[PDB]
């Protein structure tokens, strides 16, 4: 009967990609994030928006400052040594898989830094563009990041899927396989 | 290689037993290295690496800033919990249990992650030969897990969304 | 529609 929880506000600005990100986490799951370019609050589940609000221009202001701070930190650090922590990839299904029964494939990219990846879904060895969803870079307990990629699909014994993740810390693009 | 530069900031609100005991932990990162900390249990900025010392010395000389941060345990942390206690904290989603052949107990689509799953053969909990995947986070506020038993047959699932335990059994 | 609160990030140096 003990409620023990955690709320995390994570924000960052990244070079040379020139992008910033702002999000709120509750016990490990995203509550929302702010589209810095578009300036609108994006609730992780649509049903949240009935219960809360976030003034988006607040997040924009922060990233603006985080941008400026990055230059200060760059000039401050005598040497910035490039170093990378390679992701660990895992593919699996959201629900138990039944043939002909609609489901979702999850690509769990975890434990990596910097927050920049190239992720590609592969149906039968080829990229898929329809029915794919993406998660912003999520926080962890450590300094590393976490990310989710989703794929909607219809099961069949003929199809086999793969999730391929490329990150500056990997020698060879990591490809994780999944079939029936 | 490819040089990158990251300015990362995490402000963590830790709630132990509701809004009774709360600590705020702000962590500043530069790339892979955490350089600055604000621990509300300390009440001041502390540099984790030399890179963060200038910020620490600068900000700690501002009493009115420190006064505000120490207070952010009420003005922000406890504030947000008041809001999120209406829909996030009490959120409950009932698990879907499925059994298929080693015998696999598939508990999927549940929230929160508080879950207890046991294997009973002949009505006794087979507390051995248990291979579990651990808890898996789908990232959409739903969880899933596979608890397996290596015997050559009924599993029970207890969960905060269940008034009475869910039981399934095989042939 | 009660709005969640956030931490203001300060300029360094």
């Amino acid at each position, epitope marked *: 009967i003990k409620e023990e929880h955690t709320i995390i506000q994570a924000e960052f600005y990244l070079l040379p990609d020139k992008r910033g990100e702002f999000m709120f986490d509750f016990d490990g799951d995203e509550i929302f994030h702010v589209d810095i370019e578009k300036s609108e609050t994006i609730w992780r589940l649509e049903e949240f928006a009935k219960f809360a*609000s*976030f*003034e988006a*221009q*607040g997040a924009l*202001a922060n990233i*603006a*400052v985080d941008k400026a701070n990055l230059d200060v930190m760059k000039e401050r650090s005598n040497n910035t040594p490039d170093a990378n922590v390679a992701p660990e990839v895992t593919v699996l299904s959201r629900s138990p898989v039944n043939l002909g029964e609609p489901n979702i494939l999850i690509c769990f990219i975890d434990k990596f830094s910097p927050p920049v990846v190239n992720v590609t879904w592969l149906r039968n060895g080829r990229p898929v563009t329809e029915g794919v969803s993406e998660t912003v870079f999520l926080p962890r307990d450590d300094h590393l990041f976490r990310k989710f990629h989703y794929l909607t699909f219809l099961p069949s014994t003929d199809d086999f899927y793969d999730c391929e993740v490329d990150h500056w810390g990997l020698e060879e693009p990591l490809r994780k396989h999944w079939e029936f | 290689s490819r040089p990158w530069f990251l300015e990362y900031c995490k402000s963590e609100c830790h709630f132990y037993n509701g809004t009774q005991r709360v600590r705020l932990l702000v962590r500043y990162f530069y790339n892979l290295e955490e350089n600055l900390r604000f621990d509300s249990d300390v009440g001041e900025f502390r540099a984790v690496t030399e890179l963060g010392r200038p910020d620490a010395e600068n*900000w700690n000389s*501002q009493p*009115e*800033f420190l*006064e*505000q941060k*120490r*207070a*952010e345990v*009420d*003005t*922000v942390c*406890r*504030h947000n919990y008041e809001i999120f206690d209406n829909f996030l904290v009490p959120r409950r989603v009932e698990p879907t249990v499925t059994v298929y052949p080693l015998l696999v107990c598939s508990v999927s689509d549940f929230y929160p992650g508080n879950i207890e799953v046991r294997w009973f053969r002949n009505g006794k909990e087979e507390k051995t030969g248990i291979v579990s995947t651990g808890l898996v986070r789908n990232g959409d506020w739903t969880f899933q897990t596979l608890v397996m038993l290596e015997t050559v047959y009924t599993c029970q699932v207890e969960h905060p969304s269940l008034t009475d335990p869910v039981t399934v059994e095989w042939k | 529609a*009660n*709005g*969640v*609160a*956030f*931490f*203001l*990030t*300060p*300029f360094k140096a």
Partner: T-cell receptor
Framework: SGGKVIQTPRYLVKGQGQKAKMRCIPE?????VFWYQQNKNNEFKFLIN????????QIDMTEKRFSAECPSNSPCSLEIQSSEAGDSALYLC????????????FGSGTRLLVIE | GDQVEQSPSALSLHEGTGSALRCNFT?????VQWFRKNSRGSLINLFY???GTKENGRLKSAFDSKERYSTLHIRDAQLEDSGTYFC???????????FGTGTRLQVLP
């Protein structure tokens, strides 16, 4: 200097259509500067805020009708391009140290009167 | 219309008496600030409160984040305590400082 904010001039009278430039020296070591316009009802109307030379925020009126700059090692300034009767008010300058804070310290203010 | 509910509007205190000014907030405020404008004087900064109470001479100020109010207490009213008193606070869920409606305090000798 400090801890004091020096706004000059104390009073100012201009003819409709004339330029009205007013200056403000933020407290020593204070990078944050705010400009407020107060009317007869003790209402504080936000105009523009700087940090050093960079403008963080401003309103439509200040963008179209006012011109402000806060030069390095030079007094901050707010200038009305074309004064009109509606611009008669108290213009307040406030400087802070940390953008993520309050603790404004206001200046003496410039009282501007626009007449025909 | 978008200012802080500050009461009372005006106030008359006999020299040597005391009374209290109060701001009512519509949400959780991050910190509160109190100002006084003299007679032909500048805005003088009186307090910066983030929590609890602070006392400065014959002035004590209090801020309760949860209960959404802040009070300024004047005791042993003197002549120089005359002026207009403003409070200013910024909401925890916004970036913008908002001001009180103001209080005109006159001290009778």
């Amino acid at each position: 200097s400090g801890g004091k904010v020096i706004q000059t001039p104390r009073y100012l009278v201009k003819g409709q259509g004339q330029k009205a430039k007013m200056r403000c020296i933020p407290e020593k070591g204070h990078p944050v500067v705010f400009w407020y316009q107060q009317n007869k009802n003790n209402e504080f109307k936000f105009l523009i805020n700087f940090q050093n030379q960079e403008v963080l925020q401003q309103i439509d009126m200040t963008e179209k009708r006012f011109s402000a700059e806060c030069p390095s090692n030079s007094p901050c300034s707010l200038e009305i391009q074309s004064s009109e009767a509606g611009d008669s008010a108290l213009y307040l300058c406030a400087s802070s140290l940390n953008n993520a804070n309050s603790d404004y310290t206001f200046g003496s203010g410039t009282r501007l009167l626009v007449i025909e | 219309g978008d200012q802080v509910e500050q009461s009372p509007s005006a106030l008359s205190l006999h020299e040597g008496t005391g009374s209290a000014l109060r701001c009512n907030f519509t949400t959780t405020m991050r910190a509160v600030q109190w100002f006084r404008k003299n007679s032909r004087g500048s805005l003088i900064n009186l307090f910066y409160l983030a929590s609890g109470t602070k006392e400065n001479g014959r002035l004590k100020s209090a801020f309760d984040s949860k209960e959404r109010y802040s009070t300024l207490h004047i005791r042993d009213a003197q002549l120089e305590d005359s002026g207009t008193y403003f409070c200013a606070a910024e909401a925890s869920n916004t970036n913008k400082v908002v001001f009180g409606t103001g209080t005109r305090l006159q001290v009778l000798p």
